[PDB]
Amino acid sequence: FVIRGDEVRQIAPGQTGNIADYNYKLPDDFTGCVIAWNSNKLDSKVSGN
Amino acid sequence: ALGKLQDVVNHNAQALNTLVKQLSSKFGAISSVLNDIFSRLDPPEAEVQ
Secondary structure, three states: OOOOOOOOOOOOOOOHHHHHHHHHOOOOOOOOOOOOOOOOOOOOOOOOO | HHHHHHHHHHHHHHHHHHHHHHHHHHOOOOOHHHHHHHHHOOOOHHOOO
């Protein structure tokens, strides 16, 4: 999924935040990796996306 | 002259008193109350607290 760079830290087990609480919530006991990279070139049109 | 019985009773009482008082020890944690750690702290290290 795609989110802004302000909430890249919200994707974490048991972390508060609008995105974490309402869109995608990680389990408290989570084992795995999170990979986040900028998508300004790929997913930002001149008019807007 | 009933030193022994009184001593035994006092020893049991003070052992129980030490046991009941020991839970107020912080043990280096942020707080000594469980629900505070479970609610106002993130699970990833609230679990180790």
